[PDB]
C-alpha cells in the first residue's frame, strides 16, 4: 500500500477539494493560491499549496491516480524523504514558472505529477540499479497525457508553465540522482 507521504498528500488534496465545494473555489484560492498581492509575500505555504487545489473531478482523479502510482513507487523504492523533496521542488518551481507566464490564479497537482513522470522514466533509463522505472504502457499513457495538456485537448484552460516546468524538474533531478 501507499506509504505515509503518498497518503498524506492524497488526504490533503481531498480535504482541500471538499473545502472548495463547501466554501467555493474563490474563497479557498484566497488562502492557498500563489501570492497575488505584495502583502501575501511572506505567507510561505502559498508557494506550494497551489498544488493542493483542484477545480474539476477529472483533474483531481487523474492527478491523484498518477500520484498514488508514481509517488507510491518512489516512496517504496527510494524512501519518503526523496518523495518529499521531489514534491517541494516541483511545486515551487512549477508555480514560479506558471505565475511568470500567466499570473497567480492556478492550481493542481499536475506540476508534481509531470515531475514524477519524468523522474521515474529518466531514472529507470539512466540508472536501472535504482530498482525504479516507468514501464512501456505507462510511458505511452504519460506521453498522451502530456501531449493533451500542451495542445489543450481537455476542455480546460491549462497551466502550461506549471506542466512544462514540472516535467523539466523531474528529468533534472533524475539526471542528478543517476550520477
Amino acid at each position: 500500500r501507499a506509504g505515509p507521504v503518498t497518503w498524506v498528500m492524497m488526504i490533503a488534496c481531498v480535504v482541500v477539494f471538499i473545502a472548495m465545494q463547501i466554501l467555493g473555489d474563490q474563497e479557498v484560492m484566497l488562502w492557498l493560491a500563489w501570492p497575488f498581492d505584495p502583502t501575501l509575500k511572506f505567507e510561505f505555504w502559498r508557494y506550494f499549496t497551489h498544488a493542493l487545489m483542484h477545480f474539476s473531478l477529472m483533474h483531481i482523479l487523474f492527478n491523484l491516480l498518477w500520484w498514488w502510482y508514481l509517488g507510491g513507487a518512489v516512496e517504496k523504492r527510494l524512501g519518503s524523504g526523496k518523495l518529499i523533496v521531489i514534491t517541494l521542488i516541483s511545486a515551487l518551481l512549477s508555480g514560479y514558472v506558471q505565475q511568470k507566464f500567466s499570473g497567480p490564479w492556478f492550481g493542481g497537482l499536475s506540476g508534481v505529477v509531470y515531475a514524477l513522470m519524468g523522474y521515474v522514466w529518466l531514472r529507470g533509463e539512466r540508472d536501472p540499479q535504482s530498482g525504479i522505472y516507468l514501464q512501456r504502457g505507462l510511458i505511452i499513457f504519460a506521453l498522451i497525457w502530456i501531449v493533451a495538456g500542451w495542445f489543450d485537448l481537455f476542455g480546460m484552460s491549462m497551466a502550461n508553465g506549471a506542466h512544462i516546468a514540472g516535467l523539466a524538474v523531474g528529468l533534472a533531478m533524475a539526471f542528478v540522482d543517476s550520477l
Binding site: 498544488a51 512549477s94 499536475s110 514540472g166
Partner: peptide
C-alpha cells in the same frame, strides 16, 4: 477562469 496544472 483558472488555469489547471
Amino acid at each position: 477562469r483558472v488555469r489547471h496544472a
